[PDB]
A paper describes a structure:
PNNs are a condensed form of neural extracellular matrix that include the glycosaminoglycan hyaluronan and extracellular matrix proteins such as aggrecan and tenascin-R (TNR). TNC and TNR share a common domain organization that includes an N-terminal cysteine-rich region responsible for the formation of disulfide-linked multimers, followed by 5-14 epidermal growth factor (EGF)-like domains, 8 to 9 FN repeats, and a C-terminal fibrinogen (Fg)-like domain. Here, we demonstrate that TNR and TNC associate with the single fibronectin type III (FN) domain found in RPTPζ and provide a structural basis of these interactions. Overall, our findings provide novel structural insights in the interactions between RPTPζ and tenascin family members, prove that the formation of a RPTPζ–TNR complex is essential to the assembly of PNNs, and provide a blueprint to explore a potential role for a RPTPζ–TNC complex in neural function.
The complex structure was solved by molecular replacement using the crystal structures of the Fg domain of tachylectin 5A and the FN5 domain of TNC as search models, and the final model was refined to 1.8 Å (Rwork/Rfree = 0.174/0.210). Averaging over of the four complex molecules in the unit cell, the RPTPζ/TNR interface buries 496 Å2 on TNR and 535 Å2 RPTPζ for a modest total surface area of 1031 Å2. Broadly, the RPTPζ–TNR interface can be divided into a major contact site and a minor contact site, and the following description only details contacts common to all complexes in the unit cell. At the major contact site, R334, M342 in RPTPζ pack against H1317 in TNR, while Y368 stacks against R1305, H1317, and H1329. The sum of these analyses shows that RPTPζ binds to TNR through a small binding interface centered around Y368, Q369, and D370.
Numbering used by the authors:
A (entry chain B): 309 to 405, 408 to 409
B (entry chain A): 1130 to 1348
């Protein structure tokens, strides 16, 4: 059902107290299609506003995204999923959780 | 000889040196600026300075800025002529670019009727003209972009294009051509790619990048 395996080695690496460098590796397997782009989905873990957001990358080769305006000392939970050219979606990365 | 100190391979050709091989050229015709180059004297009438060749993967192309600035390798085998040299040559007049590629018996090419590389202060930005060829126009993606290496990231991607795709190039985010990438590497976008000819999961086993003055078409 999935159009690719999960993006691998998702690293968070805080740049500072408010910016997150999200990087990943291309899915190892892509099924009968091509990857068009990636979505980074994230939401606060603590606090009371558990609304999830999403950032879309430009293109299929830039394996990263900088997430800014992250509240300092707040914990966030993130997932990355590939968007394939045939409209299917890949396997969601492992969930990952600011100084 | 009509040109005592030829400044390009086309002037060698006019002198009667119509055999491909190694020749000296003299930038702006001045003897103190001698450079050793390989001249392709057969493609489309000859007269091309070859500035890059891949053909067997025995030479490492995953090098740093200083290496790509000065040049490396053997001009009779696999090599990169050097960005400072390419800048100085393409500043002599209007040059054209030709990329010739082969996969065994199948061949293709791409040509651009303007070609220049800017100077170091401008990070050797690529300028190309109008396309003709059979390989498809994969290099126009890279128009106006600075050169990047694994140790000097000038791309506009969050990632380090040169590190991720095992090469050195005028990367944007990231590439449709990767001719200094990893020899024989089929992994997506990491190999020697010319996208519109063979896609991103095929590494081209032979490629040559070469340049000639536009005005050689008049002669
Ligand atoms: Ca970058």
């Amino acid at each position: 059902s999935v159009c690719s395996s999960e993006p691998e080695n998702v690293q968070a690496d805080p740049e500072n107290y408010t910016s997150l460098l999200v990087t990943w590796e291309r899915p190892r397997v892509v099924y009968d299609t091509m990857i068009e782009k990636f979505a980074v989905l994230y939401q606060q873990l603590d606090g009371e506003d558990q609304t999830k957001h999403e950032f879309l990358t430009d293109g299929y080769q830039d394996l990263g995204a900088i997430l800014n305006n992250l509240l300092p000392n707040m914990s966030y939970v993130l997932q990355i999923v590939a968007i394939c050219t045939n409209g299917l979606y890949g396997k969601y990365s492992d969930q990952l959780i600011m100084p | 000889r009509v040109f005592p100190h030829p400044q390009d391979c086309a002037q060698h050709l006019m002198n009667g040196d119509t055999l491909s091989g190694v020749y000296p050229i003299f930038l702006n015709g001045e003897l103190s600026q001698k450079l050793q180059v390989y001249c392709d004297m057969t493609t489309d009438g000859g007269g091309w300075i070859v500035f890059q060749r891949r053909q067997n993967g025995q030479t490492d192309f995953f090098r740093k800025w200083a290496d790509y600035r000065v040049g490396f390798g053997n001009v009779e085998d696999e090599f990169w002529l050097g960005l400072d040299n390419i800048h100085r040559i393409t500043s002599q007049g209007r040059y054209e670019l030709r990329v010739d590629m082969r996969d065994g018996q199948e061949a293709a090419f791409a040509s651009y009727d303007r070609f220049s590389v800017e100077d170091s202060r401008n990070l050797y930005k690529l300028r190309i003209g109008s396309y003709n060829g059979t390989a498809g126009d994969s290099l126009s993606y890279h128009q106006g972009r600075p050169f990047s290496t694994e140790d000097r990231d000038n791309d506009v991607a969050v990632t380090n294009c040169a590190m991720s795709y095992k090469g050195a190039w005028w990367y944007k985010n990231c590439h449709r051509t990767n001719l200094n990438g990893k020899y024989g590497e089929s992994r997506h976008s990491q190999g020697i790619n010319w996208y519109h000819w063979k896609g991103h999961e095929f590494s081209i086993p032979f490629v040559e990048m070469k340049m000639r003055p536009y005005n050689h078409r008049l002669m």
